[PDB]
Structure 1
Amino acid sequence: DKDVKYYTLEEIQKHKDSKSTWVILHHKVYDLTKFLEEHPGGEEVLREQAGGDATENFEDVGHSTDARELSKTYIIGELHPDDRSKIAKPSETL
């Protein structure tokens, strides 16, 4: 396989040490280690510190200049939907 692997929530929710920030947009995991050392402001600033309902329609260009393909080559895969916001049990009843 070489197209978006199903990572886990414990593997994404465990980047408190080391480097390479693992932010998430909606269902994709971003390893923006190249952006963390690009705009010295707070390492991970891809809308994921004070909440705010996801990152709106997308990333804002308020303090960005090269906003063209930063939310693509800075990704690694997706997150297992089983851990995302969906602990329901569709089907398996009728």
Structure 2
Amino acid sequence: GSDPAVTYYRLEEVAKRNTSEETWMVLHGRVYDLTRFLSEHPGGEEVLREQAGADATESFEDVGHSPDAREMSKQYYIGDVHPNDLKPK
């Protein structure tokens, strides 16, 4: 069941956005446009460039971001990963 209020992106569409002109990334089943965040990230640009257009959930959690960082991610949230591209829990 897709949610009328949410815009969904297939991982194929996220994979296209892997350039400095447009960088998207998936974190926990949600899509973030970090294009403008790249030069402001306190963890630097490179870690984000390397996984541009991809699901970087594991790296994000391995680093262990703070509640403050998670709060900050909300400003870049743009949609949910299409139901079909979500993995079983």
Could you state the TM-score of these two structures normalised by the residue count of structure 1? 0.59
2:18 to 16, 20, 23: 16
AA aligned to 1:25 is L
SS at match of 1:35: coil
The answer to whether structure 1 residue 60 and structure 2 residue 65 are counterparts is yes
What is the match of residue 26 of structure 1?
A: 28
Distance 1:75 1:26 in 2: 11
Q: Which runs of 5+ in 2 are unaligned?
A: none
C-alpha deviations, 1:48-89, integer Å up to 9, x for none?
Answer: 47x88623289515xxxx736321011110011202225xxx
Distance 1:25 1:17 in 2: 18
Aligned length: 80
TM-score by length of 2: 0.62
Conserved in 2, the CA contact under 8 Å of 1:36 and 1:43?
no
Which protein is richer in strand relative to its size?
2
Question: Does the 8 A contact of 1:19 with 1:33 survive in 2?
Answer: yes
Aligned CA-pair RMSD: 3.6
Percent of aligned positions with the same letter in both sequences? 44
Give the C-alpha shift of residue 16 in structure 1.
Answer: 3.0
Higher helix share: 2
Q: Structure 1 residues 56 and 67 mapped into 2: Cα distance closer, same or farther (>3 Å)?
A: closer
Q: Which stretches in structure 1 are left out of the alignment for 5+ residues?
A: 87-94
